[PDB]
Amino acid sequence: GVLHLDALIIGSGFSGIYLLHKLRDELKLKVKIFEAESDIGGTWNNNRYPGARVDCPVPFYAYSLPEVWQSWNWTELYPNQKEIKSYFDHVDRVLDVRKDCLFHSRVNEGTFDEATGRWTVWTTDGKVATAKYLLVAVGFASKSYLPDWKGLDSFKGTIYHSAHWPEAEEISVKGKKVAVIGTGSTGIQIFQEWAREAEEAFLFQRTPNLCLPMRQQELHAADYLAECALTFGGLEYQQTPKNTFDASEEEREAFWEDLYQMGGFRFWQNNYQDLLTSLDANREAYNFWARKTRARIQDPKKRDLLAPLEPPYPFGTKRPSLEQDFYEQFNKSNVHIVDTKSQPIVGVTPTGIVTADEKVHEVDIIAVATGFDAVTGGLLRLGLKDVNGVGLDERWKDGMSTYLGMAISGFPNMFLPYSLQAPTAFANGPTLIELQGDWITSLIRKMEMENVQSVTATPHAESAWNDEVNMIANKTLLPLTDSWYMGSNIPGKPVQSLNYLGGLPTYRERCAKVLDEDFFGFAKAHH
Numbered sequence: 001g002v003l004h005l006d007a008l009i010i011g012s013g014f015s016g017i018y019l020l021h022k023l024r025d026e027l028k029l030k031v032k033i034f035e036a037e038s039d040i041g042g043t044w045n046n047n048r049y050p051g052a053r054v055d056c057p058v059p060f061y062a063y064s065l066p067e068v069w070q071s072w073n074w075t076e077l078y079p080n081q082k083e084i085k086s087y088f089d090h091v092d093r094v095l096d097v098r099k100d101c102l103f104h105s106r107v108n109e110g111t112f113d114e115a116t117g118r119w120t121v122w123t124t125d126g127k128v129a130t131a132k133y134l135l136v137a138v139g140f141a142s143k144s145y146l147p148d149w150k151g152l153d154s155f156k157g158t159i160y161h162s163a164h165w166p167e168a169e170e171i172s173v174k175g176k177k178v179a180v181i182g183t184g185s186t187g188i189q190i191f192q193e194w195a196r197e198a199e200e201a202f203l204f205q206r207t208p209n210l211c212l213p214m215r216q217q218e219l220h221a222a223d224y225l226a227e228c229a230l231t232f233g234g235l236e237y238q239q240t241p242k243n244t245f246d247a248s249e250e251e252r253e254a255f256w257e258d259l260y261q262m263g264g265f266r267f268w269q270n271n272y273q274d275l276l277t278s279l280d281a282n283r284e285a286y287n288f289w290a291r292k293t294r295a296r297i298q299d300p301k302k303r304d305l306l307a308p309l310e311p312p313y314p315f316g317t318k319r320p321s322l323e324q325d326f327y328e329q330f331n332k333s334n335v336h337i338v339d340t341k342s343q344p345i346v347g348v349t350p351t352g353i354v355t356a357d358e359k360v361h362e363v364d365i366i367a368v369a370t371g372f373d374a375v376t377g378g379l380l381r382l383g384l385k386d387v388n389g390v391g392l393d394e395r396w397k398d399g400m401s402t403y404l405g406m407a408i409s410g411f412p413n414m415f416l417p418y419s420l421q422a423p424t425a426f427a428n429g430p431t432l433i434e435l436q437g438d439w440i441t442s443l444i445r446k447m448e449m450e451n452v453q454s455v456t457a458t459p460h461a462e463s464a465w466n467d468e469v470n471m472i473a474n475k476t477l478l479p480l481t482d483s484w485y486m487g488s489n490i491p492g493k494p495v496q497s498l499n500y501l502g503g504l505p506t507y508r509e510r511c512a513k514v515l516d517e518d519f520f521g522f523a524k525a526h527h
């Protein structure tokens with residue numbers, strides 16, 4: 001019948017499984033996960049496209065729970081999706097997670113009743129549950145956008161959409177002419193895999209992606225995870241506490257070559273402290289990146305499209321993609337880069353893709369690598385309502401805001417790990433997830449001990465958080481990056497939410513104040 005719970009968790013990714021564990025095992029609550037799709041792992045169950053791979057190195061892209069890490073070993077510094085999914089299998093063997101998940105349970109309505117202090121939640125297939133706490137751990141959905149190109153139904157080959165990548169069987173590209181449309185991380189990853197094996201490979205690029213070198217390595221069979229957890233982003237390092245132009249030119253060059261050789265996010269998060277605050281410092285860094293990247297590319301036309309001497313946006317204002325041998329692919333004669341800023345795609349024929357200049361690029365297989373939605377899309381389809389009955393879509397039509405990235409005014413007893421206005425895209429996920437999950441767990445403990453029936457962020461605390469978020473961003477180069485333009489003007493590009501850029505140590509202090517000052521920023525109601 002109707003399922004009644006202490007807490008209901010939506011999603012079985014890193015976030016929701018951590019919460020299940022803390023709320024069920026540590027707090028001894030009655031808890032279930034409603035999960036939309038077939039199995040655990042979140043984005044790692046959902047996004048199985050070729051090349052899918054982490055961007056944070058072992059051992060950071062993992063839980064810090066000793067029972068989990070005890071017996072696990074990783075085969076390489078930056079594991080792939082299949083190996084992440086096998087880690088989730090390990091988590092389930094250790095923590096016993098699957099038996100408290102209901103799969104194929106896509107939430108499509110939530111409403112809160114102030115008199116009882118409980119949510120009532122419905123799935124698309126008709127499941128219905130009630131719960132005191134609602135933990136919305138939906139991450140970032142895929143962007144399910146198929147551009148209105150003419151002639152797609154005439155195409156004689158096949159079109160795959162990284163919003164629903166097949167599984168069952170790998171798509172073989174041997175002997176095939178292929179196209180990737182899109183240059184976010186998804187596009188970069190698919191293209192690297194496919195450019196290696198396809199008979200011919202076209203990447204359709206509107207803006208260049210400023211990719212950093214991964215430096216992959218094979219690996220072999222507590223205090224350290226604790227000290228890294230104290231950094232800006234939760235990686236092993238943070239910014240170098242010096243201004244760019246306080247170093248001489250030669251010192252800069254040698255410092256940047258060291259970063260670039262270590263690889264991964266060193267160049268982004270171990271760089272000079274004014275990388276993201278001074279446009280000139282930023283441009284000097286960029287000029288380095290371009291020099292190194294262009295040196296890898298033999299054809300001058302390809303070089304200027306992939307790594308222009310003038311930057312397309314301030315480097316580091318977005319989470320950079322990583323790459324292994326992407327730029328080298330283009331030195332093959334059958335590997336092409338098509339500039340769709342200049343010559344947009346205007347159509348598909350039976351044999352290929354047609355650009356505005358009427359050039360036909362013949363292919364057998366097309367991957368649409370639209371990449372991820374803003375955080376907004378996925379949360380708005382939940383059909384959540386505030387206590388006055390208003391949909392979150394309507395609440396947010398004029399801009400989205402939150403308290404701490406984790407609560408929304410008028411949605412009581414509802415918490416959002418790994419979501420907007422939180423350190424999210426500027427941090428290591430799992431470290432933020434555990435931080436928010438621990439906090440949510442402590443906040444629930446506190447309510448249960450104090451007999452608090454509901455807590456709801458106040459419009460004031462929300463507006464104040466939004467003002468801190470904005471103020472931190474205003475001091476950086478973020479207002480000058482091209483994301484905002486694209487979201488406001490360009491069809492298919494969703495409006496992004498600002499991350500909190502204050503760093504995990506400040507973010508922690510803001511969270512702690514809630515627990516130490518009597519639910520500071522929330523209105524409370526008692527049982």
Ligand SMILES: Cc1cc2nc3c(=O)[nH]c(=O)nc-3n(C[C@H](O)[C@H](O)[C@H](O)COP(=O)(O)OP(=O)(O)OC[C@H]3O[C@@H](n4cnc5c(N)ncnc54)[C@H](O)[C@@H]3O)c2cc1C
Pocket residue numbers: 010011012013014015016034035036037041042043044046047052053054055056057061105106107108137138139140378381382417418427428429430
């Ligand atoms: C290829 C790739 C590589 C990445 N590597 C890194 C990295 O190295 N470092 C890092 O910091 N981040 C990384 N990320 C970002 C990654 O999203 C997060 O690290 C993290 O996995 C998010 O976990 P989550 O559980 O919050 O969200 P998700 O993993 O997205 O899980 C959300 C869950 O909610 C479910 N869901 C959505 N809607 C509903 C609904 N209506 N009802 C029921 N369930 C629903 C989804 O099906 C899903 O199972 C990577 C992302 C990808 C795609």
